[PDB]
Amino acid sequence: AQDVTVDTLDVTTVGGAQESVAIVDAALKYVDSHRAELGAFQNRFNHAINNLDN
Amino acid sequence: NVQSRGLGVAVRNANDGISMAQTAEGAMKETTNILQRMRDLSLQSANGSNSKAD
């Protein structure tokens, strides 16, 4: 098992490219997951404004 | 006179009872709005189109 990340993502041979596409998918999934978490946070407080206004 | 002052604090009191009812009713609007959002969103996830990540 070797730990690789986007910073260590290197594509100079064809094999490296096949690693990169998988690595980017993991990074994109993580980014999207936290985007949803921030979106849920946004969708919590917008109900808090009009609640506290009531 | 005793009765007249009695209704003086009685109209104040019944207004207070109204105020606490509508303060609760104000937050009542938000909780039902939250419930509507959960139900509509759970209906969205009920499909097989979205994968486990969604």
Q: Rounded to an integer, what is the distance from CA B39 to the centroid of its chain? A: 17
- CB contacts of B27 in chain A (<8 Å) are 51, 54
B51: amino acid identity, one letter = S
Number of H helices, E strands in chain A: 1, 0
Handedness of CA B9, B10, B13, B14 (dihedral sign): negative
Contact A19, A9 (CB under 8 A): yes
A40: amino acid identity, one letter = A
Residue A6 gets which letter from DSSP? S
Contact B54, B45 (CB under 8 A): yes
How many Å lie between the alpha carbon of B11 and the closest alpha carbon of chain A? Answer: 24
Length in residues, chain A: 54
Q: How far is Cα A20 from Cα A25, in angstroms, rounded to an integer?
A: 9
Q: How far is Cα B35 from Cα B24, in angstroms, rounded to an integer?
A: 17
SS3 of residue A12 by DSSP = coil
Q: Give the per-residue SS3 of chain B.
A: CHHHHHHHHHHHHHHHHHHHHHHHHHHHHHHHHHHHHHHHHHHHHCCCCCCCCC
Between residues 23 and 52 of chain A, which touch chain B (CB distance below 8 Å)?
Answer: 29, 33, 43, 47, 50-51
The closest CB to that of A54, out of B30, B34, B53, belongs to B30
Which token pair is B18? 């109204």
- The resolution, in angstroms to one decimal, equals 3.2
A23 CB-near residues (< 8 Å, 6+ apart): A4, A5, A6, A9
